[PDB]
């Protein structure tokens, strides 16, 4: 029989039912399993579409890293293809980390396909300027970069607790290491470079669909002022909620706080 890796790389899964579809995208170093504490609460009222991105599940029988994955613009394009191929008419897009920005970029092109956007732990740019506080100076970025290919075994066990926060013993920190270990060393490096070189701040003014902007109050990757930045720069209506939590992946590490906030913003329009 013939072969096709585009279904396998995207790894599209659909579950539940309803008039509205909710699409779930994820951030660097993880996969669609990050939404495990969210999905059970959506299925009664919504059809839920999950997908994979940012080099997730590299070590497999058939995973070639395509050239559209060199930039975030290509991921955004690939998202629009997914929406067309499953005939989505209007959708509630929920994006974690930089998949929030890929969703934002796609909504500029086809705002009719998006009812709203829900951003979680999102940032338009990680690196600092004189005027803009991304959260990282060049030293910080290269420090993290340096250890990635020297040993991927030791980098993951040091990086994973740093991003997620709290103690290392938790299942959240272990789950993130597990998904990190599915990636290859070389693919994670090229993806890492794309993350920290990315700058999407100019796009924000073009976004016209409603955005709900959610994050942890102590995120090592995202200063609290970044939620306000996005809020002031988006072109349509928007709202901000800083949760009183720690970590870049609060849906996995603090579900008791994160999940109810996500459900409110998904189910209700901007009141």
Can you describe what's shown?
With about 270 residues, the chain is an alpha/beta fold. It has one domain (about 1-270): Rossmann fold, CATH 3.40.50. Helix content is about 40%, strand content about 15%. The PDB classes it as hydrolase. Keywords: KAI2 Karrikin Striga, hydrolase. It forms a monomeric assembly.
Helix content: 25-40%
- CATH class descriptor: Alpha Beta
Radius of gyration from the alpha-carbon trace, in angstroms:
18 Å
End-to-end Cα distance, whole Å, is 53 Å
Q: Give the overall silhouette.
A: globular
Tell me the series of helices and strands, N- to C-terminal. Answer: HEEEHEHEHHHHEHEHH
Question: Mind summarizing the main beta sheet?
Answer: 7 strands, mixed
Number of strands: 7
Question: Topology of this structure?
Answer:
Blueprint: H1 5-10, E1 13-16, E2 21-25, E3 47-50, H2 72-85, E4 91-96, H3 99-109, E5 114-120, H4 138-146, H5 152-164, H6 171-182, H7 185-197, E6 211-218, H8 225-233, E7 238-246, H9 250-253, H10 255-267
PDB class: hydrolase
Keywords: KAI2 Karrikin Striga, hydrolase
Assembly: monomeric
List keywords for this structure.
271 residues; alpha/beta
């Amino acid at each position: 029989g013939s072969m096709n890796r585009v279904e396998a790389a995207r790894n599209v899964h659909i579950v539940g039912s309803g008039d509205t579809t909710v699409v779930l995208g994820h951030g660097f170093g993880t996969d669609q399993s990050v939404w495990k504490h969210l999905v059970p609460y959506l299925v009664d009222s919504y059809r839920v579409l999950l997908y994979d991105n940012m080099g997730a599940g590299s070590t497999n029988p058939e995973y070639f890293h395509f050239e559209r994955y060199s930039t975030l613009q290509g991921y955004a394009h690939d998202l629009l293809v997914i929406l067309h191929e499953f005939n989505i008419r209007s959708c509630i897009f929920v994006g974690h980390s930089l998949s929030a920005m890929t969703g934002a970029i796609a909504s500029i092109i086809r705002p009719d396909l998006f009812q709203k956007i829900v951003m979680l732990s999102a940032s338009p740019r990680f690196l600092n300027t004189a005027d803009y506080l991304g959260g990282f100076e060049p030293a910080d970025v290269e420090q993290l970069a340096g250890a990635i290919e020297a040993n991927y075994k030791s980098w993951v066990s040091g990086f994973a607790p740093m991003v997620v926060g709290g103690d290392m013993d938790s299942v959240a920190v272990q789950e993130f290491s597990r998904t990190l270990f599915n990636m290859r060393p070389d693919i994670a490096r090229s993806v890492f470079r794309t993350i920290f070189t990315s700058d999407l701040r100019d796009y924000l003014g073009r976004v016209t669909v409603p955005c709900h902007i959610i994050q942890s109050s102590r995120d090592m990757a995202v200063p609290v002022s970044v939620a306000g930045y996005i809020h002031n720069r988006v072109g349509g209506r928007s709202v901000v909620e800083v949760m009183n939590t720690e970590g870049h992946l609060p849906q996995l590490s603090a579900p008791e706080v994160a999940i109810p906030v996500l459900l409110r913003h998904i189910k209700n329009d901007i009141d």
